[PDB]
Design a protein around this ligand. Structure first.
Ligand code: FE
Length: 310
């Protein structure tokens, strides 16, 4: 009955097999609550000391930054934090697990690569000029998108970001509950382009589907490299098991699963990608350089609600 309990902002169909493999191998029984990083953060404030969660497995670093800032997370040890090749938070209150890259997905039959803008800030302009009203997709409830927006606040300021949002909103974009839904809509011709995580494109392609992937100019907000991670909650009474699961997330077999099954980039050195994938270092070079746990995620959510996007 005393059971390791995980609040996960990561998608169930993506990570459940990994949880199942962990239970099967360690004998530790895991109970996972699948939500979004934002609802999870809300639940932990509401629950306070009564929280049953041992671990917050977040879909984005910003969310772990929030939880840390709210004093919700325990310090982690050197052993755990020495494994990831980058992105360890200065607060040392959570561990990065995978990295993913924001990209622009598009239908190549509808859009020519050469005409796409070099900056995400110019997307509304471009969409206006090509008459793409109602033909732009986005994912307002997806935490990586929310972190991208926090990223814009950090890079361009709240003012520019709000105005980008409002300009996107004027194009009457369609909102998708999931990234795969959006990518289906792109292929189907319901929308022509959308901002997403690279691994969703990778998975779409592996399944035999063709789809364009566009990078903005090095350093652009629209190329943000983000990280998943996990943090141990101070309220936890399952510390040993929760630490074990964190260790498991950085294990060869977990890391191999993330890259081979999910298509994201691993954070432990030595676990290899297929030759046909955009290499990790080229991917990182495209991104701004930011302290990820310092991303103003809360401000981004506030801004997304203010503007009516969320
Ligand atoms: Fe995802």
């Amino acid at each position: 009955s005393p059971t390791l309990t995980i609040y996960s902002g990561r998608g169930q169909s993506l990570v459940e097999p990994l949880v199942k493999q962990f239970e099967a191998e360690t004998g530790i029984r895991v109970q996972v609550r699948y939500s979004t990083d934002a609802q999870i953060l809300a639940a932990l404030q509401e629950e306070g000391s009564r929280s049953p969660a041992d671990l917050f497995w977040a879909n984005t670093a910003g969310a772990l930054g929030q939880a840390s800032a709210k004093g919700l997370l325990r310090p982690l040890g050197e052993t755990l934090l020495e494994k990831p090749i980058a992105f360890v938070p200065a607060s040392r209150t959570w561990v990065p697990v995978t990295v993913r890259l924001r990209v622009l997905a598009y239908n190549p039959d509808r859009i020519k690569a050469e005409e796409l803008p070099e900056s995400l800030l110019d997307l509304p302009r471009f969409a206006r000029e090509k008459g793409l009203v109602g033909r732009v997709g986005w994912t307002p409830t997806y935490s990586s998108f929310q972190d991208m927006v926090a990223g814009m606040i950090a890079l361009y300021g709240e003012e520019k970001t709000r105005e980008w949002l409002l300009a996107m909103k004027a194009l009457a974009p369609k909102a998708y509950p999931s990234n795969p839904a959006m990518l289906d809509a792109i292929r189907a011709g319901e929308v022509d382009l959308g901002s997403t995580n690279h691994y969703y494109v990778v998975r779409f392609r592996r399944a035999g589907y063709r789809l364009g992937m566009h990078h903005f100019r090095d350093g652009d907000a629209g190329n943000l490299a983000l990280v998943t991670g996990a943090g141990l909650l101070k309220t936890s009474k399952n510390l040993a098991a929760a630490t074990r699961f964190l260790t498991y997330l950085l294990s060869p077999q977990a890391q191999q699963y993330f890259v081979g099954n999910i298509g994201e980039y691993p954070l432990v050195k030595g676990v290899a990608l297929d030759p046909n994938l955009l290499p990790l270092e080229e991917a990182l070079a495209k991104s701004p350089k930011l302290d990820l746990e310092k991303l103003p995620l809360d401000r981004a959510l506030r801004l997304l609600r203010e503007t009516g996007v969320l």
